[PDB]
Design a protein around this ligand. Structure first.
Ligand SMILES: [Mg+2]
Ligand SMILES: [Mg+2]
Ligand SMILES: [Mg+2]
Ligand SMILES: [Mg+2]
Ligand SMILES: [Mg+2]
Ligand SMILES: [Mg+2]
Ligand SMILES: [Mg+2]
Ligand SMILES: [Mg+2]
Ligand SMILES: [Mg+2]
Ligand SMILES: [Mg+2]
Ligand SMILES: [Mg+2]
Ligand SMILES: [Mg+2]
Ligand SMILES: [Mg+2]
Ligand SMILES: [Mg+2]
Ligand SMILES: [Mg+2]
Ligand SMILES: [Mg+2]
Ligand SMILES: [Mg+2]
Ligand SMILES: [Mg+2]
Ligand SMILES: [Mg+2]
Ligand SMILES: [Mg+2]
Ligand SMILES: [Mg+2]
Ligand SMILES: [Mg+2]
Ligand SMILES: [Mg+2]
Ligand SMILES: [Mg+2]
Ligand SMILES: [Mg+2]
Ligand SMILES: [Mg+2]
Ligand SMILES: [Mg+2]
Ligand SMILES: [Mg+2]
Ligand SMILES: [Mg+2]
Ligand SMILES: [Mg+2]
Ligand SMILES: [Mg+2]
Ligand SMILES: [Mg+2]
Ligand SMILES: [Mg+2]
Ligand SMILES: [Mg+2]
Ligand SMILES: [Mg+2]
Ligand SMILES: [Mg+2]
Ligand SMILES: [Mg+2]
Ligand SMILES: [Mg+2]
Ligand SMILES: [Mg+2]
Ligand SMILES: [Mg+2]
Ligand SMILES: [Mg+2]
Ligand SMILES: [Mg+2]
Ligand SMILES: [Mg+2]
Ligand SMILES: [Mg+2]
Ligand SMILES: [Mg+2]
Ligand SMILES: [Mg+2]
Ligand SMILES: [Mg+2]
Lengths: 155, 68, 114
RNA sequence: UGGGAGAGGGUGGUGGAAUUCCCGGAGUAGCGGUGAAAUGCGCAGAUACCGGGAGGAACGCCGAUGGCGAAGGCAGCCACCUGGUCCACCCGUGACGCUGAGGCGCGAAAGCGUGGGGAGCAAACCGGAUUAGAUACCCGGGUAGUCCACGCCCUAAACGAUGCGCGCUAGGUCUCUGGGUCUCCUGGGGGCCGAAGCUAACGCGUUAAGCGCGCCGCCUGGGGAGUACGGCCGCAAGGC
């Protein structure tokens, strides 16, 4: 807000992987403050991304995450009388947030019926470079590229 | 770095003294202000008037291109 | 084909144009914000000018250009960036001189310039 | 008598920068313009670039919080013709002074007449936008006019909103231009802060709006109205 830069909340590490990054992904799945249900679905996905592909879920998950991180985004700023889509770098804190949110949102677009499955399948295709989350990243990345001419309007 | 200092006894009214005068022009050709020339009020006018005279005579430039 | 030549930059508030000529002064190739692909106000931007000087250098190199002398005219906001693009292009930049035309109180300007 | 400073004024010459148009070379896909656009211009070769030619207008740096003039106002450079003014010397004249109803001249810009000139700019006008509309503001065009000569007009926030001359009433500081012995002193201009005093306050204050004398002009609630009638001036617009 106005006064001072607020403090970032560090999440209590997950009990299956001891990972602060995994905890975040969990919370974005959490509807209605029902974390336990969100815990299953994600861990269930760890089960699924093991069966349909014999390797470490944490390795699947984390690599999938990196492939969704946008390095450049466009933030609107109506200078003069027109709305300019100013290109901006994305801080790692936001790169994390946007990748995770999109990753879960991309999951909820898929046609597979169980939540456990979708999370797996998106995380599966994400590390392999596909999936709606990576589609959104590439989009937002080209938009900032397209508007490279407004580099001098950056804050 | 006042130019009036860096020269001996010299004539302001002398419009043919190209070597003295050329010191009073900027690298871009413009006549230098008092804050750079160190001349008093009265001297400046005599200087300016003769510098212009010389420019007509081909001894001094009216303008020079700015090199970097 | 010419090794040494000239690099003229006409950069105004609305656009930046770059023309590469031979030492005699005959243009060899040229570019601008429109040539790079931009329209409207985007032509005046520094990034536009950057692309302009490059496409002007790229085409120039293809005809044997190696050395250039950069002549600058206009006080646009894309000016200095054009200079940057020519140096980092692969061209020699043996000199850079600003030669913007300034009258000695010649003609009366338009209304917007008084 | 001797000296100085200055865009004071008039006439004739003349120098470069830039804009425009035209000719040549070279070159290609756009240029221009805006908040963003469009009108517009461009493959019938534009823009941008180099060379040449033509023409008009204004004089960048110097340039200043500067200088000059009674005001309007005056700025590249040269020469001629010409006004005002300041200093020093303390030589000449012997009150020859000050103001000034009428009168006379001068009087920015726009405007008018006759004839030139016409690059840029630009009332009117055309177009493109904006907008509810946009007879505007912004953009592309554009005719008078802006320039010269001669003759008219005679208005204004023609302002310091402060009539002219003179004497007297602390100083401090910046500046221009003279003269001394040049530390500085002494004149004449240009600002700032201020003694006393003034003033309704704001502010003025040796450049008075202080204290005094002389002369002229002017005011007497707001509107109606700088209108009407009359008169004088003007080609008219219109002015008094
Ligand atoms: Mg998404
Ligand atoms: Mg001499
Ligand atoms: Mg433009
Ligand atoms: Mg005399
Ligand atoms: Mg041609
Ligand atoms: Mg030319
Ligand atoms: Mg000036
Ligand atoms: Mg005597
Ligand atoms: Mg006697
Ligand atoms: Mg009198
Ligand atoms: Mg009278
Ligand atoms: Mg008049
Ligand atoms: Mg007139
Ligand atoms: Mg007329
Ligand atoms: Mg006329
Ligand atoms: Mg007629
Ligand atoms: Mg005529
Ligand atoms: Mg014309
Ligand atoms: Mg219209
Ligand atoms: Mg309309
Ligand atoms: Mg209507
Ligand atoms: Mg217009
Ligand atoms: Mg026009
Ligand atoms: Mg007419
Ligand atoms: Mg007429
Ligand atoms: Mg008429
Ligand atoms: Mg006046
Ligand atoms: Mg005034
Ligand atoms: Mg006065
Ligand atoms: Mg009055
Ligand atoms: Mg009054
Ligand atoms: Mg009077
Ligand atoms: Mg002296
Ligand atoms: Mg004084
Ligand atoms: Mg005062
Ligand atoms: Mg007092
Ligand atoms: Mg009184
Ligand atoms: Mg009070
Ligand atoms: Mg005083
Ligand atoms: Mg006085
Ligand atoms: Mg009073
Ligand atoms: Mg009454
Ligand atoms: Mg009355
Ligand atoms: Mg009347
Ligand atoms: Mg009247
Ligand atoms: Mg009458
Ligand atoms: Mg009157």
């Amino acid at each position: 807000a106005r006064r001072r830069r607020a403090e970032v909340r560090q999440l209590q590490p997950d009990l299956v992987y001891g990972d602060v990054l995994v905890t975040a992904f969990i919370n974005k799945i959490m509807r209605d403050g029902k974390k336990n249900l969100a815990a299953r679905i994600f861990y269930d996905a760890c089960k699924i991304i093991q069966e349909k592909t014999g390797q470490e879920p944490l390795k699947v998950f984390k690599q999938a995450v990196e492939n969704v991180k946008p390095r450049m985004e466009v933030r609107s700023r109506r200078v003069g009388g027109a709305n300019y889509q100013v290109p901006m770098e994305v801080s790692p804190r936001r790169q994390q947030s946007l990748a995770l949110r999109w990753l879960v949102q991309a999951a909820n677009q898929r046609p597979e019926r169980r939540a456990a499955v979708r999370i797996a399948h998106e995380l599966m295709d994400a590390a392999e470079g596909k999936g709606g989350a990576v589609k959104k990243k590439e989009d937002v990345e080209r938009m900032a590229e397209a508007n490279r001419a407004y580099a001098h309007y950056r804050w | 770095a006042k130019v009036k200092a860096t020269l001996g006894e010299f004539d302001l009214r002398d419009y043919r003294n190209v070597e003295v005068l050329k010191r009073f022009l900027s690298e871009t050709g413009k006549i230098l202000p008092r804050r750079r020339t160190g001349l008093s009020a009265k001297e400046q006018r005599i200087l300016a008037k003769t510098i212009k005279r010389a420019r007509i005579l081909g001894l001094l430039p009216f303008t020079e291109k700015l090199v970097r | 084909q010419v090794a040494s030549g000239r690099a003229y930059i006409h950069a105004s508030y609305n656009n930046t144009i770059v023309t590469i000529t031979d030492p005699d002064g005959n243009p060899i190739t040229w570019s601008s914000g429109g040539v790079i692909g931009y329209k409207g106000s985007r032509k005046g931007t520094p990034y536009a000018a950057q692309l302009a000087a490059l496409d002007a250098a790229k085409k120039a190199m293809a005809y044997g250009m190696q050395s250039v002398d950069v002549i600058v005219r206009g006080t646009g906001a894309g000016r200095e960036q054009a200079i940057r693009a020519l140096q980092a292009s692969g061209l020699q930049v043996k000199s850079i001189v600003d030669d913007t035309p300034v009258p000695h109180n010649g003609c009366r300007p338009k209304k917007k310039f008084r």
